[PDB]
Assembly symmetry: C2
Homo-oligomer: 208 residues x 2
């Protein structure tokens, strides 16, 4: 059984939608990266891959420091692009297109104009999980079986990728509530293609 842990980065200064804007962790967010590093470092991560956005990457570096591991980076793990909503607050978006923000969360195929849907986000990240399965023999290996791959990413991607791996029907993707700052989720891949791997949800949105 292969364990996959996903960590949502800590708090940024930004209420205000980011998507793929490369915003910075706040002071609090850095403090949260250190705390999460401690928590997850005890699970003895096998390997760390991070979105290249700084709020994720700076979080992942703190986990790398704690575990003495070298952080890997992949652009397919970026936050959902939020099109015309990037840079706008909820109050602005809600005044501009009333009720759309709330309806959006209930439909995984729907995107803000110019943005990606949750389905898009699962489509571009999932091959990364498949690639790690192929290339990391130790992962779920006989020697150290429960050492998890840790992905340092963003809330939207965690939910999209998790529902995709669990093979939830798209209409049920909203069953997964939003990840909090510096919170983590764990999936387990049980047995021989990648597709035949049965993923189960071990932990959703645990505070780190």
């Amino acid at each position: 059984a292969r364990r996959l842990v996903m960590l949502r980065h800590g708090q940024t200064d930004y209420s205000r939608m980011q998507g793929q804007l490369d915003t910075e962790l706040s002071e609090l967010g850095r403090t949260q990266a250190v705390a999460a590093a401690e928590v997850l470092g005890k699970r003895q991560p096998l390997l760390i891959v991070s979105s290249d956005l700084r709020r994720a990457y700076d979080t992942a570096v703190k986990l790398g420091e704690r575990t003495g591991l070298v952080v890997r980076v992949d652009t397919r793990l970026r936050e959902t692009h939020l099109g015309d909503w990037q840079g706008l607050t909820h109050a602005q978006i809600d005044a501009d297109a009333p009720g759309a923000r709330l309806a959006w969360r209930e439909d995984a195929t729907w995107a803000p104009h110019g943005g990606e849907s949750r389905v898009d986000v699962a489509a571009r990240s999932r091959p990364l999980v498949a690639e790690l399965v192929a290339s990391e023999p130790e992962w779920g290996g006989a020697d150290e079986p429960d050492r998890p791959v840790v992905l340092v990413a963003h809330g939207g991607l965690i939910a999209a990728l998790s529902a995709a791996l669990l093979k939830l029907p798209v209409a049920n993707w909203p069953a997964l509530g939003g990840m909090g700052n510096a919170s983590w989720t764990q999936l387990s891949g049980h047995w021989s293609d990648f597709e035949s791997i049965r993923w189960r949800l071990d932990v959703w949105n645990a505070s780190a």
Copy 2:
């Protein structure tokens, strides 16, 4: 307009759960199980729940009592929150079971409509427990109400029941119920039911699964 529902699994029992089937056998918490109940109440009791309802199996009830003490609430009990009945498998080791019916134990986990002889499937457990949630919606007007919309209802229960009830509330297709994994000792799960006025139209989401 969101109702918070927290489900707590009891702590460790003096019983080898990993190799031997418990079900509705009324096993006691171990000493560690008791310490875990105190610790879990310190976390969950920090904010005052609206209400505590417990399985009447003593490993859950004793856990719920620690929470009631911490919060100054009574503990109500309900047989509908009992652990999944495992029928002829109750008290049997995995080895006994795996020799009698090779492959059955692993196949069971992957089929929410399958039950050991004499027992209950995930679907059966959802059938007895989901209506209890509907009753609480009807009987707790403060729940998700205007005054303190965040105070949760707390069910003190069992792992299999948490997964069955949670999948039923989330309205996952039965085929997808095994996507919900295990719950640890003294771990909790939280759902939020978001707003018609009928129970079926409440849309539940998973806020937290298996936090310790």
